[PDB]
Amino acid sequence: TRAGMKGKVLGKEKKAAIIDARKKAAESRKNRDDKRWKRVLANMDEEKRKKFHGVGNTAKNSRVRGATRASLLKRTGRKPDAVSMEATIHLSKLLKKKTFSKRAPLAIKRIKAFVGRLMKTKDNRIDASLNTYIWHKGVKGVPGRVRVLIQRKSETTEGNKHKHFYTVISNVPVASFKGLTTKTVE
């Protein structure tokens, strides 16, 4: 990043102080606007209030007007090294109009990149069950959706500086994909 935000240059303690500086400055401005909107909405007449719909966060099925969705997310903390996730990959949307003879090999690379982005790993092992499922209808009959189980594990080659993570991706057979969302399994 830019020199003014580098973690190595600023240091851990300085970086934390600046991040809280932005947080408190933005959070305080949100509380000011919440109070003012709470105040002027009550003051305004019911005839005028029909025009102002959703302004004071009164509306249903609505985002929080004050702040971003991400800022309201609860940052629990670092995930454990050994974590298991179950997810669906919409393979058909990644293979639209691809060359027929490369569909199954391309699906393997797409799955490895999908998991690699999620788990931040470069060593992504494909289990036999997942490989069989991808190829079970031929090189060009790849299924539109796949349900995978992602398991991240830690093991480093002795004498290496940086700890080494790797994932094992296996197929999860499902009768239907409807209603299936991404879950952290145990």
């Binding site: 990043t1 830019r2 003014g4 935000m5 025009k51 719909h53």
Partner: protein, 404 residues
């Protein structure tokens, strides 16, 4: 020897070079001629292309076969959220062209206006206009602003305002850009003192499109066309295709020049960039200046068709989304794809024609699905055709029995 038969040359040599436009936004190269007898007014506005549909109206022109008869006209819908005026600039005439005298900035500028000065705003220090804010409102700052304003009164013949779009108000998910589009809008009409008075009164204020244009007027469109990358001579210039027998290819120009001059002329069609060119388009009749759906929901309702509809077609505008702001319905088409910012300019050609003077009254606005042969104008019309479906029974049965 002379060519055996004559035909007009392919393409317009005045639109050269056929290169990529310097900017993605439409910019007016000239403004309509200033006439001092009119009250001061703005001459341009920035809009966003949402999509296309068609309307029905009666034709008023006498002597035509379609007089007092209905016609169907394709229209383009362009979203026009209000614009914010942030600055004033003055120009003085010199023997080598107009020179900017100075810039009077507003006391407060929006965050999305200051984002235009950054390549990575969220990770920056966000110090734009921080020293200008501290210098302004001081004893020396107030004097400097007054001196610049007096210089405009004494030496300026052209007064323009600095305006920017509001991407927060647009609330479009596919537009992507969060930094405002900045442009200069010339203040035409009145004396130079009167022009400065209006520009000062507009500082830090919102300007709506309906205060710049009227419903039945025409306007010019400055925009950049859709890009196609590298294209051959057949598509780029419209030359004929060679016979199937041709060796080494058909989609070519057979002779790219005579022996002498021993050169290829600039008038010969060659492959290269096609599209993404700036174009100023003339005489686009405004058919409707719509209000925001939060204020008036019945945008597509007319006096003849009483159905309560918005301007947004069933299923949304393809690749754009919902029109949530004020909008302009221009007759016909404009250059460029959806999501692209465009400039509407007050017309520069004479507007004395019967077609240009005609008062437009819309009788029907189509809101059917732009996805695959829309046959319903509203969601209620679709419900009446199908009635209850299997998924409606499941949703109702669970609510009727499990929840009650």
């Amino acid at each position: 020897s002379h060519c055996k038969f004559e035909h007009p040359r392919h393409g317009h040599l005045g639109f050269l070079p056929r290169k990529r436009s310097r900017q993605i936004r439409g910019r007016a190269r000239a403004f309509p001629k200033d006439d001092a007898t009119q009250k001061p007014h703005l001459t341009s506005f920035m809009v966003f292309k949402a999509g296309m549909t068609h309307i029905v109206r009666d034709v008023d022109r006498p002597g035509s076969k379609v007089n007092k008869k209905e016609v169907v006209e394709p229209v383009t819908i362009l979203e026009a959220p209000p614009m914010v005026i942030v600055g004033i600039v003055g120009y003085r005439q010199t023997p080598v062209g107009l020179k900017t005298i100075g810039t009077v900035w507003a006391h407060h500028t929006s965050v999305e206006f200051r984002r235009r000065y950054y390549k990575n705003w969220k990770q920056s220090a966000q110090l734009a206009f921080s020293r200008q804010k501290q210098f302004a409102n001081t004893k020396e700052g107030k004097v400097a602003e007054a001196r610049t304003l007096n210089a405009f009164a004494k030496k300026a013949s052209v007064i323009r305002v600095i305006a920017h779009t509001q991407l927060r108000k647009l609330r479009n998910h596919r537009v992507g850009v969060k930094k405002a589009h900045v442009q200069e809008i010339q203040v035409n009409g009145g004396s130079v003192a009167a022009k400065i008075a209006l520009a000062k009164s507009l500082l830090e204020k919102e300007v709506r499109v309906d205060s710049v244009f009227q419903q039945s007027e025409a306007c010019d469109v400055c925009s950049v066309t859709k890009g196609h990358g590298t294209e051959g001579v057949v598509k780029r210039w419209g030359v004929a295709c060679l016979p199937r027998k041709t060796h080494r290819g058909l989609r070519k120009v057979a002779c790219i020049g005579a022996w002498h001059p021993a050169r290829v002329m600039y008038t010969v069609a060659r492959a290269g960039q096609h599209g993404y060119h700036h174009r100023t388009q003339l005489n686009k009749k405004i058919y409707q200046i719509g209000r925001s759906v939060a204020v008036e929901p019945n945008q597509a309702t007319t006096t003849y068709d009483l159905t309560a509809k918005t301007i947004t077609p069933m299923g949304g505008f393809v690749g754009y989304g919902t029109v949530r702001n004020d909008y302009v319905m221009l007759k016909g088409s404009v250059s460029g794809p959806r999501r692209r910012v465009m400039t509407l300019r007050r017309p520069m050609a004479p507007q004395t024609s019967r077609q240009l003077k005609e008062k437009i009254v819309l009788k029907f606005i189509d809101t059917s699905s732009k996805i695959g042969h829309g046959r319903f104008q509203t969601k209620k019309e679709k419900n009446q055709w199908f009635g209850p479906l299997k998924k409606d029974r499941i949703r109702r049965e669970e609510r009727l029995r499990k929840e009650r």
